[PDB]
Design a protein around this ligand. Structure first.
Ligand SMILES: Cc1cc(Nc2cc(-c3ccc(F)c(NC(=O)c4cc5c(s4)CCCC5)c3F)nn(C)c2=O)nn1C
Ligand SMILES: c1ccc(P(c2ccccc2)c2ccccc2)cc1
Length: 266
């Protein structure tokens, strides 16, 4: 039921790299509108499964979400057409601009993401792979959340298994590592790690630990340290995302309220 975009209306212009579904390109729709085009590599996605639920994903509409514009399913490979973000992913943006950010801008980035996630939460829609690498930055510095829900359609045991080399262990709460129990609260945990990515200016969480060591140690209570640029109030917010027990973690509505309160204080 999604918008079936006419592939004749797409002009491919540049390569944007490769991800879990293969090649992604920058292009235009009807000669005018910038778009990103995922060309879904054969065998990389549960395609019929994705097509069944693409309209739900398209119905997610929020300024801080990288919008799914539509799909092209009448040939092989299929295409997913989304909003284009000229400054690329947030992790590289943090690392490339590390020495220019003021602390107010770090908090604003967190707010952008929190707004998107509060919206997803209100629609009972799980991201499942929230991390700085899956946030993108537009030409005016606005951060938006991308690739929400797509984890569910990946065909790659290294990504889908919690002991696979590609699974997002460092963004996962204990109940995901142990029971594959995804919920709004596993997105909350990941958001806390994302806040840490932002305030550390793009450091790798649990650097020097392997994935299995990270899993072992977070299950025993290890938590990420306070980045130098995070105030105590900011750290309290990200740390609240990491309660061992999922039902003790806040909602995104509460987190957004906490972030706004810090802004008001400053
Ligand atoms: C200068 C510049 C601008 C720019 N802009 C964009 C790049 C990409 C993009 C490119 C390559 C990618 F590999 C991915 N991620 C994925 O494909 C997947 C992630 C996940 C998948 S698939 C399934 C499981 C969950 C996570 C991208 F999102 N997208 N969008 C919307 C852009 O606007 N890039 N650069 C270099
Ligand atoms: C009016 C015009 C464009 C848009 P979106 C769009 C979605 C799918 C296909 C084509 C366009 C848009 C896309 C790129 C840049 C700015 C807006 C929304 C209202």
């Amino acid at each position: 039921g999604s918008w079936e975009i006419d592939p004749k209306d797409l002009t491919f212009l540049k390569e944007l790299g490769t991800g879990q579904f293969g090649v992604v390109k920058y292009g235009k729709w009807r000669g005018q509108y910038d778009v990103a085009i995922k060309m879904i590599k054969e065998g990389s996605m549960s395609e019929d499964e994705f097509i069944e639920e693409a309209k739900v994903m398209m119905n997610l509409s929020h300024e801080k979400l990288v919008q799914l514009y539509g799909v092209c399913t009448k040939q092989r490979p299929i295409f997913i057409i989304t909003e284009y973000m000229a400054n690329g992913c947030l992790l590289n943006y943090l690392r490339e601009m590390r020495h220019r950010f003021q602390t107010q801008q770090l908090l604003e980035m967190c707010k952008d993401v929190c707004e998107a996630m509060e919206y997803l939460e209100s629609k009972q829609f799980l991201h499942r792979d929230l991390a700085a690498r899956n946030c993108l930055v537009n030409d005016q510095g606005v951060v938006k959340v991308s690739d929400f829900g797509l984890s569910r359609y990946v065909l790659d045991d290294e990504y889908t298994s919690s002991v696979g080399s590609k699974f997002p262990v460092r963004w996962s709460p204990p109940e995901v590592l142990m029971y594959s129990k995804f919920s709004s609260k596993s997105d909350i945990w990941a958001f806390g790690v994302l806040m840490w990515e932002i305030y550390s200016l793009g450091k790798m969480p649990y650097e020097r630990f392997t994935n299995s060591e990270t899993a072992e140690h977070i299950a025993q209570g290890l938590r990420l340290y306070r980045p130098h640029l995070a105030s105590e109030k900011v750290y309290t917010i990200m740390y609240s995302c990491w309660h061992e027990k999922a039902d003790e973690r806040p909602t995104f509505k509460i987190l957004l309220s906490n972030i706004l309160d810090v802004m008001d204080e400053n």
